[PDB]
Design an enzyme around this catalytic site. Structure first.
Site, PDB file in Angstrom:
ATOM      1  N   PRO A   1     -25.197  47.676  -9.595  1.00 37.40           N
ATOM      2  CA  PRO A   1     -26.648  47.487  -9.506  1.00 37.40           C
ATOM      3  C   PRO A   1     -27.007  46.384  -8.517  1.00 37.40           C
ATOM      4  O   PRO A   1     -26.295  45.387  -8.412  1.00 37.40           O
ATOM      5  CB  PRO A   1     -27.042  47.040 -10.927  1.00 37.40           C
ATOM      6  N   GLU A   2     -28.105  46.583  -7.795  1.00 33.19           N
ATOM      7  CA  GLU A   2     -28.606  45.569  -6.877  1.00 33.19           C
ATOM      8  C   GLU A   2     -29.502  44.600  -7.635  1.00 33.19           C
ATOM      9  O   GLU A   2     -29.793  44.799  -8.816  1.00 33.19           O
ATOM     10  CB  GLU A   2     -29.388  46.236  -5.737  1.00 33.19           C
TER      11      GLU A   2
ATOM     12  N   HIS B   1     -14.356  54.012 -19.990  1.00 26.37           N
ATOM     13  CA  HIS B   1     -14.305  52.853 -19.091  1.00 26.37           C
ATOM     14  C   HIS B   1     -14.969  51.617 -19.673  1.00 26.37           C
ATOM     15  O   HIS B   1     -15.490  50.790 -18.929  1.00 26.37           O
ATOM     16  CB  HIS B   1     -14.897  53.203 -17.716  1.00 26.37           C
TER      17      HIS B   1
ATOM     18  N   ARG C   1     -15.186  51.370 -12.060  1.00 29.85           N
ATOM     19  CA  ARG C   1     -14.432  50.689 -11.003  1.00 29.85           C
ATOM     20  C   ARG C   1     -13.634  49.518 -11.525  1.00 29.85           C
ATOM     21  O   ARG C   1     -12.802  48.949 -10.811  1.00 29.85           O
ATOM     22  CB  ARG C   1     -15.368  50.232  -9.884  1.00 29.85           C
TER      23      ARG C   1
END
Ligand SMILES: [Zn+2]
Length: 251
Positions: free
Chosen positions: A1-2, A92, A111
Site C-alpha cells: 500500500p502507498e 500467507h 511477498r
DNA sequence: GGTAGACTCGGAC
DNA sequence: GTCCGAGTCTAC
C-alpha cells in the site's frame, strides 16, 4: 500500500483494536521481526499490553500500546485484518496478535517482505525505522525551502531525491512519477539543476497529488498517449526504479 | 559523510 | 533464471 492507503488503514483499523489487550503473539515467519532481534522476546514483551492508539509516519504504522510502540511497514503487499480466533487464518499470515476477547490482528503478505520493530514508546522515534524520517508531505514542515536546500546539496537526480525517506516521508514511486509529470520536470534531471520556480511548482504538485489521493497521468501508462498532449508515455530506469514520463510535457 | 551496493521475498515474465 | 519495489544495513 502507498501512503494514502496506509492512512486509510490507520483510520479504519484503530476502532477495531483500540482498548483490546494482547493475550498472545504468534509468529510464523520470525524474519519479519527486526527488534528485538529475537522473535520470542518480541512476542513476550507485547503480552499484557493494551492497544491505545494508532498513528502513521510516512508509510509506517505506529501502534501505541501501554509501554511499547510497534512500528510496522507493510511494503507493497502487506495487509492487516481483524478477525475471530475461531476461524482459519488467511494464506500467507506471518504474525498474529491475539486479544483477550477472542479476536486477532493478523498481518499477512504474499511477498513476506514487511518489517516489525518494538521499542518503549519514548524511544521509537529515535530508533530504526523511524529515526531520520523526513517531514510528512502534507505538513508545513515539508516546504519549498526544505526541498530546495536538499536539492542544491546533492549530485543525485530529482527522482532519487524525492524517493529519499530522509527528504520527505513515504512518497512512493507512483507519486514521484505523477508529481514530476504534473510539475513538468523530467525525473532524470539533476536535483541541483532545478530553478526556484521549478522547486516551488514541484512542491505544489507533490502536495496536490498526495492530498488528492488521501481525500494516473503516467504511472504504468508507457506506450499510451499522454492525457495532456497525446505524446506516447515512455518508461526508463531512473534511480534504480521503473520511471514513467511524458517527453513533451516534462523538461 | 554522501552515496551506491547488498540484502529481504516470491509472482510475473 | 531474472526482474523488481522500500528502506535498512554495509561499505566505500
Ligand atoms: Zn504530455
Amino acid at each position: 500500500p502507498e501512503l494514502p492507503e496506509v492512512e486509510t488503514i490507520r483510520r479504519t483499523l484503530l476502532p477495531l483494536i483500540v482498548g483490546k489487550t494482547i493475550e498472545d503473539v504468534r509468529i510464523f515467519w520470525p524474519n519479519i521481526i527486526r527488534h528485538p532481534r529475537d522473535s520470542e522476546a518480541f512476542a513476550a514483551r507485547m503480552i499484557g499490553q493494551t492497544v491505545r492508539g494508532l498513528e502513521r509516519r510516512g508509510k509506517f504504522l505506529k501502534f501505541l500500546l501501554d509501554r511499547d510502540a510497534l512500528i510496522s511497514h507493510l511494503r507493497m503487499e502487506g495487509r492487516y485484518a481483524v478477525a475471530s480466533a475461531l476461524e482459519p487464518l488467511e494464506p500467507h499470515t506471518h504474525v498474529v496478535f491475539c486479544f483477550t476477547d477472542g479476536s486477532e490482528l493478523r498481518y499477512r503478505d504474499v511477498r513476506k517482505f514487511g518489517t516489525m520493530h518494538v521499542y518503549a514508546k519514548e524511544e521509537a522515534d529515535r530508533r530504526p525505522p523511524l529515526a531520520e524520517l523526513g517531514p510528512e508531505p502534507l505538513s508545513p514542515a515539508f516546504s519549498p525551502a526544505v526541498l530546495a536546500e536538499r536539492a542544491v546539496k546533492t549530485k543525485r537526480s530529482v527522482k532519487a531525491l524525492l524517493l529519499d525517506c530522509t527528504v520527505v516521508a513515504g512518497f512512493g514511486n507512483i507519486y514521484v512519477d505523477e508529481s514530476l509529470f504534473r510539475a513538468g520536470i523530467l525525473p532524470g534531471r539533476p536535483a541541483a539543476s532545478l530553478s526556484s520556480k521549478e522547486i516551488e511548482r514541484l512542491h505544489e504538485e507533490m502536495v496536490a497529488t498526495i492530498g488528492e489521493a488521501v481525500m494516473l497521468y503516467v504511472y504504468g501508462r508507457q506506450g499510451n498517449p499522454c492525457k495532456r498532449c497525446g505524446t506516447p508515455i515512455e518508461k526508463t530506469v531512473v534511480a534504480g526504479r521503473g520511471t514513467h514520463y511524458c517527453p513533451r510535457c516534462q523538461r
